[PDB]
Design a protein around this nucleic acid. Sequence first.
DNA 1: TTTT
Length: 230
Amino acid sequence: MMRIVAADTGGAVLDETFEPIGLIATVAVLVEKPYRSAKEVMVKYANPYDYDLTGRQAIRDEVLLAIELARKVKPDVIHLDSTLGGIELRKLDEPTIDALGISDKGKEVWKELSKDLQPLARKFWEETNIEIVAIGKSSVPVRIAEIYAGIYSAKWGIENVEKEGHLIIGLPRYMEVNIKDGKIIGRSLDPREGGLYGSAEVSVPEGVKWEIYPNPVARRFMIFEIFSKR
DNA sequence: TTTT
Ligand SMILES: [Mg+2]
Ligand SMILES: [Mg+2]
């Protein structure tokens, strides 16, 4: 049946205040029936130190990665993580945005992303028939991409806790990570979603420990705290 | 809008 590509951006390095500093991973996934996991993945790491948190960088990074993965694997459709009711990105011009039911800042950021992303969605559509749709939180593949973003942020944490000495990572909404036998398994904590999961291989440098607990300043989000081999 |  329907094969979908989706992207999301989702690691977050935090300060001792538990407040975000920057995002870590952008991940595009290919999802087939039965839509609990990813057949294929593309990961692009950002620099969480010096990241734009207003949304412009994350959404732009998502569309470019997903289009890359989509051109290769040819899904039926791409799912973009922005809850705009499913309108196609190739149709998201400025007046179509100004007529949306969203916050003035929402319109301000999208219209600015529109300038370059909307023609980019149109070009890709003219040559593949593949829509990019702003479905956001009601898409299962987007949630899978989010879970993979979490997974690869754990992986990024583990492999960069040496440069740093301590690392505080905010995972995406209600998900956990487990690491056993050299691989990260991420799972949604939401039973309502139907058992979504992913995994990535990791190489854990001996001596490095980690711990998962709630973020006190962001209910429903978990902290992945990792201590350097000391 | 999106991030946690
Ligand atoms: Mg997102
Ligand atoms: Mg997300």
